[PDB]
Amino acid sequence: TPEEKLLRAIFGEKASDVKDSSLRVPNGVSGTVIDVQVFTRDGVEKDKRA
Amino acid sequence: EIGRTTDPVRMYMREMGTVELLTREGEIDIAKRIEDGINQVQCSVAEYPEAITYLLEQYDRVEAEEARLSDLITGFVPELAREKFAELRAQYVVTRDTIATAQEEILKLSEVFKQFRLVPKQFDYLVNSMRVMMDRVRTQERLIMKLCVEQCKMPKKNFITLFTGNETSDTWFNAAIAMNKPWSEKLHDVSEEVHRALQKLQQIEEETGLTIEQVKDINRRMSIGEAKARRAKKEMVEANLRLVISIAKKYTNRGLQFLDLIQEGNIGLMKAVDKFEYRRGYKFSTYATWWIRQAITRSIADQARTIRIPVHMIETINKLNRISRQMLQEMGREPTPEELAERMLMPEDKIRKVLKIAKEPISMETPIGDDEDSHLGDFIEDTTLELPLDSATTESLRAATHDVLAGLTAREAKVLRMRFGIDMNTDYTLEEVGKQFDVTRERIRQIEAKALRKLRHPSRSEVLRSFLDD
């Protein structure tokens, strides 16, 4: 949108290449994490937690 | 028993069963009638020289590197074809140079033409050119009859007697006027149109190179042949409707309606009838089944899904499903997509894409239990809308940037507004801005850099710095 190019020129900021879609706790509820399970598809390298 | 029903299937079944199926002898008789009609039409269309003229023109265009030999002749009844075409050209030129032998040489040329197996599109072009010329002739004739029979009010039988055969001279022109009746001498004004129609007929006759009565004879002869062929084909279709239905019975649960399937089968049956040959000795059902099933399957692959999928990809999906089913039956349980690559010949990603292809879409009005009588469409939200918080942030940023740009000098604000798409329909490039301001591009760049440095200087744009939410 207009004036955003001007704002970036003043601030020298770069636009994020990715978008935040992380999972977060619903509002108004608290608790403790007791179990974590990870499922992965065949052909995909597993990570340290897996 | 004409009514008391609503489903069109019953009425279709009644109309179809009103007729009775054929036998081998009837099929042979209908094939013989079709062949006779086709031969008569072929003779009638070969008896004209304009067919040979168009053949020679098309051959010349082919030889002029403008077409191919494929759409010239459909085989024969390629040096032999070239020599036959040269012989045909020689026959045509001697025919045009032999204007009482012209009729016999035209007959010989027609026989040689019938000895050639042309293309159906070429035959249709000849037929429609014949139709165009006969339509022009009949339009001229109807103008002729309207100019005196419907205008001079001259007698019916007298008109017939003095017009049957001549159609060219003033037999119907001066006689209708100078016959001492009180209503005859009043249309010398339309005598000019009569002369114009006569000139048009003379020009058409000169272009054709033949008479008119023979043209009419050929026209109605080929019309009779076409009517006979159409009647025979209609009889064949009405006889084989039962076979069409029997073949279409087995595809009733593949996303298409039974009526649609039987209509496609009827189309395929008509196509098969158009190309059936009885000289091979095989029955018509064997030849018609292939065409009917091909048409039905093509229709199913074409118009049975919300999102169209090509025929080759549909065949690939069907082959994959058949393999998977066979392997499941043979081995014992559902296999893995990785293992299908060993059985088939795939790079292991095409199978994944085929599996990832979306199925038929879910209905929007499907229900989910009771849910206070709510459907699936009540839980879908539009993602194209902008938040009112976002709109208010945008308005605030516009106000703040306007306030910040008011503080700068007038020239700086103008050059900024010109460089960026601010408060105008579109922005302007640095070169157009320099040209408008009568200032070199580098000086414009330096002034812009000074403005940017001054804006980067602190004790200003604090709200602009605060406009970051990170």
UniProtKB/Swiss-Prot annotation, chain A:
UniProt PTM comment: Acetylated on several lysine residues in the presence of glucose.
Top-level taxon of the source organism: Bacteria
Biotech / industrial applications: Co-administration of salinamide and rifampicin or salinamide and myxopyronin suppresses the emergence of resistance to both antibiotics.
UniProt function note: DNA-dependent RNA polymerase (RNAP) catalyzes the transcription of DNA into RNA using the four ribonucleoside triphosphates as substrates. Resistance to the antibiotics salinamide A, salinamide B, rifampicin, streptolydigin, CBR703, myxopyronin, and lipiarmycin can result from mutations in this protein.
Subunit record text: The RNAP catalytic core consists of 2 alpha, 1 beta, 1 beta' and 1 omega subunit. When a sigma factor is associated with the core the holoenzyme is formed, which can initiate transcription. The rRNA transcription and antitermination complex (rrnTAC) consists of RNAP, NusA, NusB, NusE (rpsJ), NusG, SubB, ribosomal protein S4, DNA and precursor rRNA; S4 is more flexible than other subunits. In pull-down experiments interacts with CedA. (Microbial infection) Interacts (via flap domain) with Escherichia phage lambda antitermination protein Q; this interaction renders bacterial RNAP resistant to transcription pausing and allows it to read through termination signals.
Family: Belongs to the RNA polymerase beta chain family.
Descriptive protein name: DNA-directed RNA polymerase subunit beta
Organism this protein belongs to: Escherichia coli (strain K12)
Gene: rpoB
